[PDB]
């Protein structure tokens, strides 16, 4: 299904290596030509060795082979469609009718399911089957669970967006602290849960939790080979500032938070800026405060030519 052989040849010939330089020691010149022709399957072990002989990254080879796009299988297409249905809420119905029934078919489809449920709440679309069956679904998915995979964190990240924090709380706790890295994808979803949960805590002034998520994130920087996402690290760090402000009413912290929000504008992160402004506004309100003239200036400017923004979506 993946023209891996094609890639081996391409890389081999570009690098000027001869077939002998690859199959010698590994396999027969006849069978290798069968591999490089995309007629005979290749084991990850074989590919692993060819990768070492070529001097090109294993994963890069896979990517070049066509696995560099999560559109290789069913679920892939469905996730890409979420973005589409999010800006074209008219395509919701017919599509949601097809996903809803398969929501428990695999963690993949459930993540996709929650994906639609998000679009619905956003566009104030009625999804009665949700409120009626989610607690059941979760019970079914997370009951005899001991370890969690990347999609697990993905699911909980989206869950935090369509379910009151209190219901999601108990499901999260057994998923941290994290002890190892298992890929960029895994490292990314494990940070999203933390980042969304830290946001919810702060918005609820639930500082005991916010503190917890901050420590959990901080801990991730300790783990070897874990790719800490820049943006998140910046946005989480901003939440850290507002956290210190709610704690010791320290003004420096508030300034730093505002200053961070500024940087997002300076570097071009339009949505993140819009997002954190509307956020610092609300949190300041609940605190009997009035943010600086600019922060408060952007707000009305956004909430008018925006009113109801689309949440961030990573893929």
């Amino acid at each position: 299904m993946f023209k891996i052989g094609s890639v081996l040849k391409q890389i081999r010939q570009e690098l000027n290596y001869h077939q002998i330089d690859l199959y010698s020691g590994i396999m027969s010149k006849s069978v290798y030509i069968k591999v490089e022709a995309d007629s005979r399957p290749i084991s990850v072990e074989e590919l692993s060795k060819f990768s070492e002989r070529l001097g090109v990254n294993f994963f890069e080879i896979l990517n070049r082979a066509g696995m560099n796009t999560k559109s290789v299988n069913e679920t892939g297409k469905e996730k890409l469609l979420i973005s589409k249905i999010f800006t074209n809420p008219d395509l919701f119905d017919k599509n949601f009718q097809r996903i809803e029934p398969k929501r428990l078919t695999s963690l993949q489809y459930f993540s996709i399911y929650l994906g639609y449920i998000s679009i619905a709440h956003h566009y104030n679309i009625e999804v009665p089957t949700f409120n009626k069956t989610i607690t059941s679904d979760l019970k079914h998915l997370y009951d005899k669970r001991t370890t969690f995979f990347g999609i697990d964190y993905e699911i909980v990240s989206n869950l935090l967006n369509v379910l009151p924090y209190e219901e999601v709380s108990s499901i999260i706790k057994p998923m941290y602290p994290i002890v190892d890295s298992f890929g960029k994808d895994y490292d990314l979803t494990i940070q999203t849960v933390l980042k969304n949960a830290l946001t919810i805590s702060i918005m609820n002034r639930n500082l005991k939790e916010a503190q917890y998520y901050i420590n959990q994130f901080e801990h991730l920087k300790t783990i070897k080979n874990i790719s800490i996402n820049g943006c998140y690290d910046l946005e989480i760090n901003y939440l850290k500032q507002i956290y210190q402000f709610l704690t010791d009413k320290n003004i420096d912290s508030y300034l730093n938070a505002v200053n961070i929000i500024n940087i997002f504008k300076i570097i071009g992160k339009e949505d993140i800026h819009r997002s954190l402004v509307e956020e610092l506004t609300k949190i300041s309100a609940k605190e009997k405060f009035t943010p600086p003239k600019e922060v408060t200036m952007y707000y009305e400017n956004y909430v008018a030519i925006e009113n109801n923004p689309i949440p961030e979506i990573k893929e």
């Binding site: 996709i112 993905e154 989206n158 967006n161 946001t199 998140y232 954190l276 893929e315």
Partner: peptide, 7 residues
Amino acid sequence: AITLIFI
């Protein structure tokens, strides 16, 4: 805010 992740 709440980032929707679909990797």
